[PDB]
Amino acid sequence: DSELQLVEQRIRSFPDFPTPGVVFRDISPVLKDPASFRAAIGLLARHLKATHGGRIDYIAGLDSRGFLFGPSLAQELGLGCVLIRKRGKLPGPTLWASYKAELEIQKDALEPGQRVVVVDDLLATGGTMNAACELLGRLQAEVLECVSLVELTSLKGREKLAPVPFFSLLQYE
Amino acid sequence: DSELQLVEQRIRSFPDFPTPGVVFRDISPVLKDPASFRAAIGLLARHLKATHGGRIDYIAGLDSRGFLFGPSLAQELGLGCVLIRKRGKLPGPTLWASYSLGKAELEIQKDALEPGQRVVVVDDLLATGGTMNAACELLGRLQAEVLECVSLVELTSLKGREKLAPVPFFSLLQYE
Ligand SMILES: Nc1nc2c(ncn2[C@@H]2O[C@H](COP(=O)(O)O)[C@@H](O)[C@H]2O)c(=O)[nH]1
Numbered sequence: 001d002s003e004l005q006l007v008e009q010r011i012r013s014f015p016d017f018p019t020p021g022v023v024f025r026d027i028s029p030v031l032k033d034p035a036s037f038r039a040a041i042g043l044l045a046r047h048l049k050a051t052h053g054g055r056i057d058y059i060a061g062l063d064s065r066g067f068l069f070g071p072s073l074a075q076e077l078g079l080g081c082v083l084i085r086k087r088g089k090l091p092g093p094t095l096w097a098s099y100k101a102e103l104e105i106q107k108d109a110l111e112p113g114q115r116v117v118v119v120d121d122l123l124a125t126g127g128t129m130n131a132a133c134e135l136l137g138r139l140q141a142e143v144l145e146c147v148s149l150v151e152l153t154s155l156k157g158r159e160k161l162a163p164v165p166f167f168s169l170l171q172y173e
Numbered sequence: 174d175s176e177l178q179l180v181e182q183r184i185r186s187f188p189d190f191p192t193p194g195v196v197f198r199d200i201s202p203v204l205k206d207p208a209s210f211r212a213a214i215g216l217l218a219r220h221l222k223a224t225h226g227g228r229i230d231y232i233a234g235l236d237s238r239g240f241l242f243g244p245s246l247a248q249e250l251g252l253g254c255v256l257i258r259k260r261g262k263l264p265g266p267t268l269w270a271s272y273s274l275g276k277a278e279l280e281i282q283k284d285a286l287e288p289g290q291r292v293v294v295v296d297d298l299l300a301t302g303g304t305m306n307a308a309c310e311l312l313g314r315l316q317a318e319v320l321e322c323v324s325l326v327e328l329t330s331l332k333g334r335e336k337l338a339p340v341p342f343f344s345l346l347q348y349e
Pocket residue numbers: 023024025026027062063065120121122123124125126127128129157
């Protein structure tokens with residue numbers, strides 16, 4: 001897939017960041033190359049349409065690298081984007097979950113029964129995405145799927161999200 | 174302007190957040206309404222094309238709510254987006270700049286831009302101008318040329334515009 005290649009070739013890997021032995025996958029070059037960013041959004045949108053058809057009501061973007069992809073992905077799908085933030089940031093009534101960071105969402109972000117796909121840049125342990133799913137569940141939203149550009153498969157984040165489906169463009173050990 | 178109205182109607186105000194006496198302007202509903210979001214990006218893009226023609230090399234988006242607009246704006250203009258992040262998040266060699274929020278620090282990769290490259294900075298809202306000023310400083314230290322800073326909202330009583338001068342500033346909407 002030449003589109004996927006446009007994305008993969010713009011992932012930059014930094015050894016020993018932030019700790020010795022870890023390899024950080026830097027997605028910033030994807031954003032800097034407009035053809036790469038377009039390919040990433042296109043591939044995610046095509047997957048989501050092919051999997052869910054018209055069932056998705058909103059994209060939920062995770063603070064803050066999910067914010068980079070969520071709105072463009074939503075726009076490509078003709079959908080709005082709701083925001084899940086680090087705690088203390090959102091005004092008005094909210095719910096929060098601590099996973100030690102805390103996520104937050106406005107109580108009126110979604111109505112009961114609305115269906116959402118959650119997007120972040122990368123899935124590692126799955127802690128962040130798992131917390132997002134729980135928050136959304138407490139609004140009585142249905143999480144159809146979580147998606148990311150990158151998945152670190154040796155950390156088994158996918159298993160953590162089960163039974164909510166997960167999809168990534170690229171996988172690294 | 175029907176387009177501008179689509180954006181203004183989707184700004185929500187929260188008095189006494191985060192402190193008593195102020196009014197937080199919430200842009201979240203703009204993102205939730207795809208017509209509103211499209212209008213905001215379109216208005217910003219049209220302004221930038223009308224003001225700079227083809228001279229913009231990159232959009233620089235500010236962590237974290239600038240990230241919501243930066244890539245879509247960049248895409249609309251056919252440009253890439255570079256990131257200015259809260260300190261501690263970026264790999265590789267970086268520069269950072271403090272400003273009062275106590276203090277916060279923004280950071281950029283030393284290799285984000287080459288000397289002479291021309292950039293427009295975007296954030297959701299301009300208040301005191303501290304955040305945008307820090308971004309401008311970082312970019313200047315890379316020897317990039319900051320053509321303009323833009324936002325959806327400007328709180329004019331806080332005089333952030335003057336703080337950025339002589340770098341031009343543009344907002345879609347203004348409140349006291
Ligand atoms: N871009 C990038 N983000 C990472 C990396 N490791 C962790 N993250 C960030 O941390 C979260 C995923 O970590 P998790 O909660 O799944 O362990 C995501 O929000 C992601 O932005 C990495 O190697 N690259």
